[PDB]
């Protein structure tokens, strides 16, 4: 069989091990990012598998540099390892060149690292997709997404995980280019509630983060009071 | 420091002073310079204090391992050789150690001189340390393979004593051991001030 | 300080060495032996720095004996000399140089007796007779004066005894006893020590 | 099947069977419980005894003055990981002269244990840990898995029949924060006791306890030292 | 065929399981811990009268206060025994004190899962050790017996058997052991049990026995000292 | 050597003498000490010619590659940072005193000193090399905030000329460059074009 | 030539009693002709039963004590018990010798209780030569303190005096006297004297004022 | 560094009730040449900690780079733990010792000031890993000229107000300008309290030259 | 990667090393190559496989290699593998000479190469060399010598032997005609031709189809020569004259 190693092509030119790693991301619950006028907002449907867990356990939103957030789906241990790679890359860039790594370059660098795990029998592909978001006055708002093959693109809106398509269709309804981060957080929460399957998976925590003019270009958790208002708006909107 | 040893009919006599110095400062008068490698083997210490203590302790470790692996007592020849081979790699790095490895094995009483310069030699009598020249004079004039046991104790004790008297860097007490066919014994410890009283 | 001598006759090589091991102003041993048997018909005589001398000689000795065990027969005096030289020379510019001066004496079934001289730099010279140490300065001319290539072993020991008497007379060091050995077709023979 | 022998082989469902198999090593271990109040973090463990004349395997290990662990799965992997944790703790006191925050140590475990899940010829760690600690953010109970995932817990149980212990803990967890220490350890014991066959009981030979908190360095209680805690399960 | 570090669906390393099965091919050894010391006894398993019995050594001295009995693939035990010996001597060297039985056992057991074919040095261990070990000794905790197997799991035991007839021998051990039993009683009991389980007739040349006591160093029983004990049995 | 750079609103001016000496032999009398690192970023070199040439070549490589990857012009600050990293790291094996100057769209004209030892500091104007000693007083007294490009050029040419008169290790021609959004303009002052200040006869 | 060492001063002292040990040090930290601080003790608690005094090059004192602290924990983790006073002493010997060719510029004196509950003092050179002593002075004023201890605790050079056991009270009075004498003549010894008394009950602390000049 | 190049002179520090103040001139000297006359020799490390460095300025810039990055790394985790001033001083002790032990020192003498949990922190670290804490510190010539004045005031009154500590530091900076030929009359004062770290400057002392007419 | 590793260096269930055996099958198909020891010398004779008309003839032989002053070899099996091994032989022989300042004794050179071959059967996961060699030489310990080695790293000394195509048949004819202690180079030569004549039964023997080298001693020096085609035809002629005598 042709699907056991990332160093073997199938007869049709596929690399099934990379496709299988993508299936792990596709089994995961949904994360979304939206770029808007003045920043980027992330939301995650964070399934709570036991009531014994603390609020905040198994975060899927990370700070990878002071200006850069990361939102993940897939195998969480692989994602965290990638967050460490991203951190190290941002750190090394600052030490060598003396300024904050531009988002696009950071995306391209980590994507090549992911890519390097798709060529060899010696290692396996990462079972994770992740978004990177930042904001500065010079570069504006930027949102990138990187998948297990190592492809990297920029987005106005993005979703990863199992209700990806349903999320995208809701994101498409927003005129995000003209909205602010404060307006968008509510819409992020709304969309997570829409795509959540309340029958099949019973309990989730909404996780929210942002980076924008309003945080002065720092990636930060959305404050508690603003998250709660956004949940309440999403919940009532579901009605 | 002054240390001596000699083979004779009844085994091997081993003796030492007990002074340690840091330059001209007397750091101790109660140092043990004869180390008990096992119940049939002793090592004597002269030169760098840390160097002697460390390398003889390591020799002891190795001799014990040997004995466990091979199921028999290491010979005096093989023990002395282990020490020589250990220190040889460090020549030129400023280790300072002069030791006598004293035992009784299948070849009978055994006595090897080993030092940090690389020397390893078997012989009947040796003295090592800053006071060795003074000990040699006395030991040489009284030594005989057929010394009686108590005469041999007297000679060793007197030679170290006389070394402590001339050599600023030797003193304290004279510690004396006797290696016999069934093991070494600790024979005496005599403060040089009490020996002075006695010898006049 | 250490004295080595060799004298090669038509069918033997005679060699001698002092028996002192000294340290600072004292002789610490007076029955020291500076000869190492490499094989039935080869002696290596080694002097120089402490540690280096035995480490070097014993390493050569074990490798010569290894060659015997591996192959069923022994290295010739000439092969052993060249083996010794390769090792010394190869170490000369290394982190572990050996500060040793040597004579190699042997008897080969087909070449007859051989005496080789080597210095710490690993220059190798075959010689009819030779010596190392400060004592060499006072004895080499005695050898040049009285040696002949056909010298008999009874006369070689006499010549040796003129050299050693000259050290007693004229050398500032106290070297009162010497090991003496001869090699021929029948291997290595111990002679009486020459003493004063 | 062709997909279950190498940690580097994804299955067509997006799973890694070697990691799932490693998790079975923890499910077959003897049960352990971890829980916390506002002020203390407690571990309680059942020790399995090979024969009737064996001591009972150590389940609870000291990591640093402020951190201890309970283990389930391959004991040799447990020691390897425990030695890693110990060393990370020593490093932090050497460098910074302060304790390694518990959540940071658990991060380091995740990163260390993920690495062999992605390289050919390596294997996951076949051990799960409950981690009790106390630092500036108060008491903690963390759980670590062979998958290299980890969890921050109000309380937890892993090992054989731990479902029962987890159920008990959910049932009473709203009481834990306000419990004094005796109360909290009692809860840990009652949870652990749910894992046992109905005949059998907690004894001084089969129970081990570990406690750390504000006033108290990580301390292990075994044999006669568990009796105070076992009496007045009233 | 799969790699040496492959887990089974039950969460066990195949190689380790298989190594535990090799222990069953060994001769039986017994350890008993009493308040007066520990004894170690082992079936030699002589396969020809031409073999020298004294060349079978399945009980070894680790240090003066610690012996070790082995069963399984005996050749594998050599590096383990040497590691224990080196470790106790290192501990003495560094700390000027004897190493505990538990500590020795721990040090050796840290080798157990150090095998595999792409983490390690140009020719590191390819498989686990096919050996089980009983460490019996005396330290400041008093007399002590510890068992270790190829999983690297180790534990203190009051009495334990290992090798071919360990089931069997372990049952007889539960039957006869008591905490206040004397050393002489434990010696008799382990020879009675070896005698049951052994295929050959027990005698003073086809077994070995050693003790360690608070008084006294590691002591291997001589032919003559075995003969004395064997009279009652 | 004497090297200098000066910031103005929209760019920078750089200058150097052209003397290279071995002992007191002049091995090159028309040295070009102002080396382009990218389209609008130059470095002025003093110290060992072997060292500053090797370091400048290396930085040119690093910066060019970085620039292609980013698809943007490079920051003057980035060029200086690359010099600093290399000059600091290898401070025990290099004798290099560098001024990095240039223009980028984000921060405009900028001057950085990387003196021996490998510290880095931004300055309004910078001087270095052996001849700089003799013009500290002059530049301190003559510098004015808000000079035009043409004034910066004159101020540079004068300072360098004074240094060159007094320092045996400086001389020859004065090389100048001005850098701005529009580009780089280079020129040489030679012979009678070098500013002249009388010897003070009785 | 960068020098990697500097002399920072300091005097240490330890005395073994029948059921106690004392470890004492001044609190001055010096460099050249200057005082860094007047409150820098040279004593470090290792266990409930063991204290170490360290003087010499402060950079090495700090590093060495942190190494010792880490090694005590490592020992406790592998062996399930605290290190004894004698095992700490043997270990220190090896840690010092590991820097045989770039030494720790530290004079160490250990004071504590042995395994029978008796006072124990161990004294070291910088490369780890050591022995047990009944009492010992170290550091800057050691040549000033030691002879007096020889005379007053060892009874040396005295005829017709009963060799009594050393009481804690007398040993305390001696410690304070010798440091006061040392503060008169050694420029490095001064400010304050810190005394640790180790007994079965634990470790207690006294401090006495010394001259500030 | 084997050979320091551009260097800074004294750094001062003193504890006061509710915080710590440190001071340093803004000069980098190149031998006797007062070469870089507007450089800051003080770093805000994080909210509770600040650092001032004497000695080689390039080496200081390196430490600032390393330490700045370490603080960012730690903030990324967003986990409620921060390096205390004592931790930073520990770290710095290790780093300097370690570089000294490779025979390749960072050529600096440093003063770490902080405030955390109601406690003022003031600590010294030198290029050899000599480190300690005290109520006041002064590196370089400050050890001879400023420290005696600091300690004399502190013996009479161990607890200073903020404004008293600030005036005392200004008096020491004046003395240093009079007597240290590598000083400069343009300095910064940095203060840490509950509220964080503030760096003020550029500052100057008044000077008096009446003694110029008292020679005859 | 465990799936692709064909495991060249492991035992099979009967204690066999399959690669080694398989390499021995490759050899048995290669050009016949014989060695014959005499009182005054030693020889090698080999079937040439380089026989197409358009070949150019540029070296002094096809399969005979000079190793040092006193020794030569021939080979049967994979040619490129033989080039590696013969290069290594020359290196070993110079290493010795450098170190001892005398020629390597014949058996010592063979054994050194055989230890390399052995290693390739025991560790490293590589295919063995598909070469058997016949070595001829003189040394001062045993005089004229003939050795044979194969891909197992095994070797032996022989008075006469054969490797390559029809070896078994060639050894039978040697067993029957070879006179222990009484052969000369001239009669060994005749015998070599007799043997090749039978064992090249595809087809009628010709000088273009064989290579012969002799190793003799002349004035205290070893002489190693490859016979010219004139001499080879003469020996073939003599053998064909001889078979005319065979009945009457
Ligand atoms: Cl997806
Ligand atoms: Cl004594
Ligand atoms: Cl051994
Ligand atoms: Cl000898
Ligand atoms: Cl001495
Ligand atoms: Cl378990
Ligand atoms: Cl296990
Ligand atoms: Cl998991
Ligand atoms: Cl579980
Ligand atoms: Cl078993
Ligand atoms: Cl140039
Ligand atoms: Cl410069
Ligand atoms: Cl410059
Ligand atoms: Cl210049
Ligand atoms: Cl010019
Ligand atoms: Cl400036
Ligand atoms: Cl800052
Ligand atoms: Cl040749
Ligand atoms: Cl040759
Ligand atoms: K000029
Ligand atoms: K004083
Ligand atoms: Mg040497
Ligand atoms: Mg250079
Ligand atoms: Mg004073």
UniProtKB/Swiss-Prot annotation, chain A:
The modification N6-acetyllysine is found at residues 51, 200, 224. InterPro entries: Ntn_hydrolases_N, Proteasome_alpha, Proteasome_alpha-type, Proteasome_asu_N, Proteasome_sua/b. The modification Phosphoserine is found at residue 237. PROSITE patterns: PROTEASOME_ALPHA_1, PROTEASOME_ALPHA_2. GO terms for molecular function: ubiquitin protein ligase binding. The keyword Cytoplasm applies. Belongs to the peptidase T1A family. The 26S proteasome consists of a 20S proteasome core and two 19S regulatory subunits. The 20S proteasome core is a barrel-shaped complex made of 28 subunits that are arranged in four stacked rings. The two outer rings are each formed by seven alpha subunits, and the two inner rings are formed by seven beta subunits. The proteolytic activity is exerted by three beta-subunits PSMB5, PSMB6 and PSMB7. Interacts with AURKB. Interacts with CDKN1A. Interacts with MDM2 and RB1. Interacts with the C-terminus of TBXA2R isoform 2. Interacts with DNAJB2. (Microbial infection) Interacts with HIV-1 Tat protein. Component of the 20S core proteasome complex involved in the proteolytic degradation of most intracellular proteins. This complex plays numerous essential roles within the cell by associating with different regulatory particles. Associated with two 19S regulatory particles, forms the 26S proteasome and thus participates in the ATP-dependent degradation of ubiquitinated proteins. This is Proteasome subunit alpha type-3. It comes from Homo sapiens. The gene is PSMA3.
Swiss-Prot record, chain B:
One of its GO terms (biological process) is proteasome assembly. Changing residue 49 to T: Displays resistance to the bortezomib, a proteasome inhibitor of the chymotrypsin-like activity. Displays high resistance to the bortezomib, a proteasome inhibitor of the chymotrypsin-like activity. The keyword Protease applies. It comes from the Eukaryota. GO terms for cellular component: centrosome; cytoplasm; cytosol; extracellular exosome; nucleoplasm; nucleus; proteasome complex; proteasome core complex. It catalyses: Cleavage of peptide bonds with very broad specificity. Keywords: Cytoplasm, Host-virus interaction, Hydrolase, Nucleus, Protease, Proteasome, Threonine protease, Zymogen. It is an enzyme of class 3 (hydrolase). Bortezomib binds at residue 49. Induction: Down-regulated by IFNG/IFN-gamma (at protein level). Induced in breast cancer tissue. Up-regulated by sulforaphane in breast cancer cells. GO terms for molecular function: endopeptidase activity; peptidase activity; threonine-type endopeptidase activity. The keyword Transmembrane helix does not apply. It is found in: Cytoplasm; Nucleus. Its EC number is 3.4.25.1. The active site is at 1 (nucleophile). The 26S proteasome consists of a 20S proteasome core and two 19S regulatory subunits. The 20S proteasome core is a barrel-shaped complex made of 28 subunits that are arranged in four stacked rings. The two outer rings are each formed by seven alpha subunits, and the two inner rings are formed by seven beta subunits. The proteolytic activity is exerted by three beta-subunits PSMB5, PSMB6 and PSMB7. Directly interacts with POMP. Interacts with ABCB1 and TAP1. The gene is PSMB5.
Swiss-Prot record, chain C:
Induction: Up-regulated in ovarian cancer cell lines. The modification N-acetylmethionine is found at residue 1. It is found in: Cytoplasm; Nucleus. Gene3D superfamilies: Glutamine Phosphoribosylpyrophosphate, subunit 1, domain 1 (3.60.20.10). GO terms for cellular component: cytoplasm; cytosol; extracellular exosome; membrane; nucleoplasm; nucleus; proteasome complex; proteasome core complex. Pfam families: Proteasome (PF00227). Keywords: Acetylation, Cytoplasm, Host-virus interaction, Nucleus, Proteasome. Its main location: cytoplasm. One of its GO terms (biological process) is proteasome-mediated ubiquitin-dependent protein catabolic process. The 26S proteasome consists of a 20S proteasome core and two 19S regulatory subunits. The 20S proteasome core is a barrel-shaped complex made of 28 subunits that are arranged in four stacked rings. The two outer rings are each formed by seven alpha subunits, and the two inner rings are formed by seven beta subunits. The proteolytic activity is exerted by three beta-subunits PSMB5, PSMB6 and PSMB7. Belongs to the peptidase T1B family. Non-catalytic component of the 20S core proteasome complex involved in the proteolytic degradation of most intracellular proteins. This complex plays numerous essential roles within the cell by associating with different regulatory particles. Associated with two 19S regulatory particles, forms the 26S proteasome and thus participates in the ATP-dependent degradation of ubiquitinated proteins.
From Swiss-Prot, chain D:
Its main location: cytoplasm. PROSITE patterns: PROTEASOME_ALPHA_1 (PS00388), PROTEASOME_ALPHA_2 (PS51475). It is found in: Cytoplasm; Nucleus. GO terms for biological process: immune system process; negative regulation of inflammatory response to antigenic stimulus; proteasome-mediated ubiquitin-dependent protein catabolic process. Keywords: Acetylation, Cytoplasm, Glycoprotein, Immunity, Isopeptide bond, Nucleus, Phosphoprotein, Proteasome, Ubl conjugation. SMART domains: Proteasome_A_N. The keyword Signal does not apply. Glycans are attached at residue 107. Gene3D superfamilies: Glutamine Phosphoribosylpyrophosphate, subunit 1, domain 1. The keyword S-adenosyl-L-methionine does not apply. One of its GO terms (molecular function) is lipopolysaccharide binding. One of its GO terms (cellular component) is centrosome. Pfam families: Proteasome (PF00227), Proteasome_A_N (PF10584). Induction: Induced in breast cancer tissue (at protein level). Up-regulated in liver tumor tissues. Component of the 20S core proteasome complex involved in the proteolytic degradation of most intracellular proteins. This complex plays numerous essential roles within the cell by associating with different regulatory particles. Associated with two 19S regulatory particles, forms the 26S proteasome and thus participates in the ATP-dependent degradation of ubiquitinated proteins. Belongs to the peptidase T1A family. This is Proteasome subunit alpha type-1. It comes from Homo sapiens (Human).
């Amino acid at each position: 069989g042709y699907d056991l190693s990332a160093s073997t092509f199938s007869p049709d030119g596929r690399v099934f091990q990379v496709e299988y790693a993508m299936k792990a991301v596709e089994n995961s619950s949904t994360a979304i990012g939206i770029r808007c006028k003045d920043g980027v907002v992330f939301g995650v449907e964070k399934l709570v598998l036991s009531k014994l867990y603390e609020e905040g356990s198994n975060k899927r939103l990370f700070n990878v540099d002071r200006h850069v957030g990361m939102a993940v789906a897939g195998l969480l241990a692989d994602a965290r390892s990638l967050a460490d790679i991203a951190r190290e890359e941002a750190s090394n860039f600052r030490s060598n060149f003396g300024y904050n790594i531009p988002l696009k370059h950071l995306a391209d660098r980590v994507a090549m690292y992911v890519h390097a795990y798709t060529l060899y029998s010696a290692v396996r592909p990462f079972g994770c997709s992740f978004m990177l978001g930042s904001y500065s006055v010079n570069d504006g708002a930027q949102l990138y997404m990187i998948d297990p093959s190592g492809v990297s693109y920029g987005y106005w809106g993005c979703a990863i995980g199992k209700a990806r398509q349903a999320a995208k269709t809701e994101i498409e309804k927003l005129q995000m280019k003209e909205m602010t981060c404060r307006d968008i957080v509510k819409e992020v929460a709304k969309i997570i509630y829409i795509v959540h399957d309340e029958v099949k998976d019973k309990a989730f925590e909404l996780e929210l983060s942002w980076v924008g003019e309003l945080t002065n270009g720092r990636h930060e958790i959305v404050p508690k009071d603003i998250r709660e208002e956004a949940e309440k708006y999403a919940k009532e909107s579901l009605k | 420091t002054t240390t001596l040893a000699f083979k004779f009919r009844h085994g091997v006599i081993v003796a030492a002073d007990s002074r340690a110095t840091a330059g001209a400062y007397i750091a101790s008068q109660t140092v043990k310079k004869v180390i008990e490698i096992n119940p049939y083997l002793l090592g004597t210490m002269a030169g760098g204090a840390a160097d002697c203590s460390f390398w003889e302790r390591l020799l002891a470790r190795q001799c014990r391992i040997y004995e466990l692996r091979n199921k028999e007592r290491i010979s005096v020849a093989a023990a002395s050789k282990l020490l020589a081979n250990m220190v040889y790699q460090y020549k030129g790095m400023g280790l300072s150690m002069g030791t006598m490895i004293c035992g009784w094995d299948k070849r009978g009483p055994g006595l090897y001189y080993v030092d940090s310069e690389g020397n390893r030699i078997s012989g009947a009598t040796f003295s090592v340390g800053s006071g060795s020249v003074y000990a040699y004079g006395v030991m040489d004039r009284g030594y005989s393979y057929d010394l009686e046991v108590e005469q041999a104790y007297d000679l060793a004790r007197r030679a170290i004593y006389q070394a402590t008297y001339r050599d600023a860097y030797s003193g304290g007490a004279v510690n004396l051991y006797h290696v016999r066919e069934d093991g070494w014994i600790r024979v005496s410890s005599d403060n040089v001030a009490d020996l002075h009283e006695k010898y006049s | 300080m250490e004295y080595l001598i060799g004298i090669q006759g038509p069918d033997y090589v005679l060699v001698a060495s002092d028996r002192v091991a000294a340290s600072n102003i004292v002789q610490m041993k007076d029955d020291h032996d500076k000869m190492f048997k490499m094989s039935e018909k080869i002696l290596l005589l080694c002097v120089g720095e402490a540690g280096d001398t035995v480490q070097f000689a014993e390493y050569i000795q074990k490798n010569v004996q290894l060659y015997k065990m591996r192959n069923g027969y022994e290295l010739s005096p000439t092969a052993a000399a060249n083996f010794t030289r390769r090792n010394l020379a190869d170490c000369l510019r290394s982190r572990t140089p050996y500060h040793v001066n040597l004579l190699l004496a042997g008897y080969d079934e087909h070449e007859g007796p051989a005496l080789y001289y080597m210095d710490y730099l690993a220059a190798l010279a075959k010689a009819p007779f030779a010596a190392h140490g400060y004592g060499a300065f006072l004895t080499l001319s005695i050898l040049d004066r009285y040696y002949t290539p056909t010298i008999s072993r009874e006369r070689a020991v006499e010549l040796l005894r003129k050299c050693l008497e000259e050290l007693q007379k004229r050398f500032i060091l106290n070297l009162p006893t010497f090991s003496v050995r001869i090699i021929d077709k029948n291997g290595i023979h111990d002679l009486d020590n020459i003493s004063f | 099947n062709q997909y279950d022998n190498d940690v580097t082989v994804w299955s067509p469902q997006g799973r890694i069977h070697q990691i799932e198999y490693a998790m079975e090593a923890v499910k077959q271990g003897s049960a352990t419980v971890g829980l916390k109040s506002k002020t203390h973090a407690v571990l309680v463990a059942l020790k399995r005894a090979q024969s009737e004349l064996a001591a009972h395997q150590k389940k609870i290990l000291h990591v640093d003055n402020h951190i201890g662990i309970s283990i389930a799965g391959l004991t040799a992997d447990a020691r390897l990981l425990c030695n890693f944790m110990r060393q990370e703790c020593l490093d932090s006191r050497f460098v910074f002269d302060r304790p390694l925050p518990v959540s940071r140590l658990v991060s380091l475990i995740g990163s260390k244990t993920q690495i062999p899940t992605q390289r050919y010829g390596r294997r996951p760690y076949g051990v799960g840990l409950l981690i009790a600690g106390y630092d500036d953010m108060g008491p903690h109970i963390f759980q670590t898995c062979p998958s290299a995932n980890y969890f921050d817990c109000r309380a937890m149980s892993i090992g054989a029949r731990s479902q029962s212990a987890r159920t008990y803990l959910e049932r009473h967890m709203s009481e834990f924060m306000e419990c004094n220490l005796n109360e909290l350890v009692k809860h840990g014991l009652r949870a652990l006791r749910e894992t046992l066959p109905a005949e059998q009981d907690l004894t001084t030979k089969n129970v081990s306890i570990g406690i750390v908190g504000k006033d108290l360095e990580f301390t292990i209680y075994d044999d006669d030292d568990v009796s105070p805690f076992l009496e007045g399960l009233e | 065929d799969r790699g040496v570090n492959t887990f089974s669906p039950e969460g066990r390393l195949f190689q380790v399981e298989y190594a535990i099965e090799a222990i069953k091919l060994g001769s039986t050894a017994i350890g008993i811990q009493t308040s007066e010391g520990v004894c170690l006894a082992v079936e030699k398993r002589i396969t020809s009268p031409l073999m020298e019995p004294s060349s079978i050594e399945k009980i070894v001295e680790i240090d003066a206060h610690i012996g070790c009995a082995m069963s399984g693939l005996i050749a594998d035990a050599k590096t383990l025994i040497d590691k224990a010996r080196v470790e106790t001597q290192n501990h003495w060297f560094t700390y000027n004190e004897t190493m505990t039985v538990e500590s020795v056992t721990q040090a050796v057991s840290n080798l157990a899962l150090q095998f595999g074919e792409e983490d390690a040095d140009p020719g590191a261990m390819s498989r686990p050790f096919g050996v089980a070990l009983l460490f019996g000794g005396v330290d400041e905790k008093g007399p002590q017996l510890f068992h270790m197997d190829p999983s690297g799991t180790f534990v203190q035991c009051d009495a334990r058997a290992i090798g071919s007839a360990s089931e069997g021998a372990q049952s007889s051990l539960q039957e006869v052991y008591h905490k206040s039993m004397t050393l002489k009683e434990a010696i008799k009991s382990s020879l009675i049990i070896l005698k049951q389980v052994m295929e050959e007739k027990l005698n003073a040349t086809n077994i070995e026995l050693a003790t360690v006591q608070p008084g006294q160093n590691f002591h291997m029983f001589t032919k003559e000292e075995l003969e004395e004990v064997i009279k009652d049995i | 050597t004497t090297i200098m750079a000066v910031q103005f609103d929209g760019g920078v001016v750089l200058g150097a003498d052209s003397r290279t000496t071995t002992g007191s032999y002049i091995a090159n009398r028309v040295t070009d000490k102002l080396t382009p690192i990218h389209d609008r970023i130059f470095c002025c070199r003093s110290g060992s010619a072997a060292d500053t040439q090797a370091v400048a070549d290396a930085v040119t490589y690093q910066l060019g590659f970085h620039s292609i990857e980013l698809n943007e012009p490079p920051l003057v600050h980035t060029a200086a940072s690359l010099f600093k990293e290399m000059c600091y790291r290898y401070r025990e094996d290099l004798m290099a005193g560098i001024i990095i100057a240039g223009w980028d769209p984000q921060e405009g004209g900028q001057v950085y000193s990387v003196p021996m030892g490998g510290m880095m500091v931004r300055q309004s104007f910078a001087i270095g090399g052996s001849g700089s000693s003799y013009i500290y007083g002059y530049v301190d007294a003559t510098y004015r905030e808000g000079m035009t490009k043409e004034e910066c050029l004159q101020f540079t040419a004068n300072a360098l000329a004074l240094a060159m008169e007094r320092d045996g290790s400086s001389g020859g021609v004065i090389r100048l460059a001005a850098i701005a959004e529009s580009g780089v303009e280079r020129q040489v002052l030679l012979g009678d074009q070098i500013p002249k200040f009388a010897v003070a006869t009785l | 030539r960068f020098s990697p060492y500097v002399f920072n001063g300091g005097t240490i002292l330890a005395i073994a009693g029948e059921d106690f040990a004392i470890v004492a040090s001044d609190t001055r930290l010096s460099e050249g002709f200057s005082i860094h601080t007047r409150d820098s003790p040279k004593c470090y608690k290792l266990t409930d039963k063991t204290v170490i005094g360290c003087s010499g090059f402060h950079g090495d004192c700090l590093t060495l004590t942190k190494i010792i602290e880490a090694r005590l924990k490592m020992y406790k983790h592998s062996n399930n018990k605290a290190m004894t006073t004698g095992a700490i002493a043997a270990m220190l010997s090896t840690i010092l010798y590991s820097r045989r060719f770039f030494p720790y510029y530290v004079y160490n004196i250990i004071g504590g209780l042995d395994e029978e509950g008796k006072g124990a003092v161990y004294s070291f050179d910088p490369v780890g030569s050591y022995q047990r002593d009944s009492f010992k002075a170290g550091g800057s004023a050691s040549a000033m303190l030691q002879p007096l201890l020889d005379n007053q605790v060892g009874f040396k050079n005295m005829q017709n005096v009963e060799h009594v056991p050393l009481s804690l009270d007398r040993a305390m009075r001696l410690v304070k006297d010798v440091f006061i004498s040392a503060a008169e003549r050694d420029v490095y010894t001064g400010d304050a004297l810190r005394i640790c008394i180790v007994t079965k009950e634990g470790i207690r602390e006294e401090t006495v004022s010394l001259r500030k000049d | 560094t084997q050979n320091p190049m551009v260097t800074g002179t004294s750094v001062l520090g003193v504890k006061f009730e509710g915080g710590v103040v440190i001071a340093a001139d803004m000069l980098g000297s190149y031998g006797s040449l007062a070469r870089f006359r507007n450089i800051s020799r003080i770093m805000r490390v994080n909210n509770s900690t600040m650092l001032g460095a004497s000695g080689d300025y390039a080496d200081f810039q390196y430490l600032k780079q390393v330490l700045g990055q370490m603080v960012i790394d730690e903030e990324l985790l967003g986990d409620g733990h921060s390096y205390s001033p004592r931790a930073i001083h520990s770290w710095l002790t290790r780093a300097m010792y370690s570089r000294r032990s490779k025979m390749n020192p960072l050529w600096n003498t440093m003063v770490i000031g902080g405030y955390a949990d109601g406690e003022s922190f003031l600590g010294y670290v030198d290029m050899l890993g000599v480190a300690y804490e005290a109520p006041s510190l002064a590196t370089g010539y400050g050890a001879y000229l400023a420290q005696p004045l600091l300690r004399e005031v502190l013996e009479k009154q161990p607890v200073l107000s903020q404004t008293e500590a600030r005036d005392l530091v200004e008096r020491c900076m004046r003395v240093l300008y009079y007597r240290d030929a590598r000083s400069y009359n343009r300095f910064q004062i940095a203060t840490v309290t509950e509220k964080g770290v503030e760096i003020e400057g550029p500052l100057s002392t008044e000077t008096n030259w009446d003694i110029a007419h008292m020679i005859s | 990667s465990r799936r692709y590793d064909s495991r060249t260096t492991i035992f099979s269930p009967e204690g066999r090393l399959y690669q080694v055996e398989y390499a021995m099958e490759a050899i048995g198909h290669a050009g016949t190559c014989l060695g014959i020891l005499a009182n005054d010398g030693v020889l090698l004779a080999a079937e040439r496989r380089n026989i197409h008309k358009l070949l150019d003839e540029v070296f002094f032989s096809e399969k005979i290699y000079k190793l040092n002053e006193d020794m030569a070899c021939s080979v049967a099996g994979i040619t490129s593998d033989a080039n590696v091994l013969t290069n290594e032989l020359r290196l070993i022989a110079q290493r010795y000479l450098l170190q001892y300042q005398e020629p390597i004794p014949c058996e010592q050179l063979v054994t050194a190469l055989c230890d390399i071959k052995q290693a390739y059967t025991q560790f490293g996961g590589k295919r063995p060399f598909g070469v058997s060699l016949l070595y001829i030489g003189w040394d001062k310990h045993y005089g004229f010598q003939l050795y044979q080695s194969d891909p197992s790293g095994n070797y032996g000394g022989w008075k006469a032997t054969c490797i390559g195509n029809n070896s078994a048949a060639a050894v039978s004819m040697l067993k029957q005609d070879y006179k222990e202690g009484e052969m000369t180079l001239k009669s060994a030569l005749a015998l070599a031709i007799k043997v090749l004549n039978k064992t090249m039964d595809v087809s009628k023997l010709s000088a273009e189809k064989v290579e012969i080298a002799t190793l003799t001693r002349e004035n205290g020096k070893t002489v190693i020569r490859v016979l010219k085609q004139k001499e080879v035809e003469q020996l073939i002629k003599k053998h064909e004259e001889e078979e005319a005598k065979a009945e009457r």
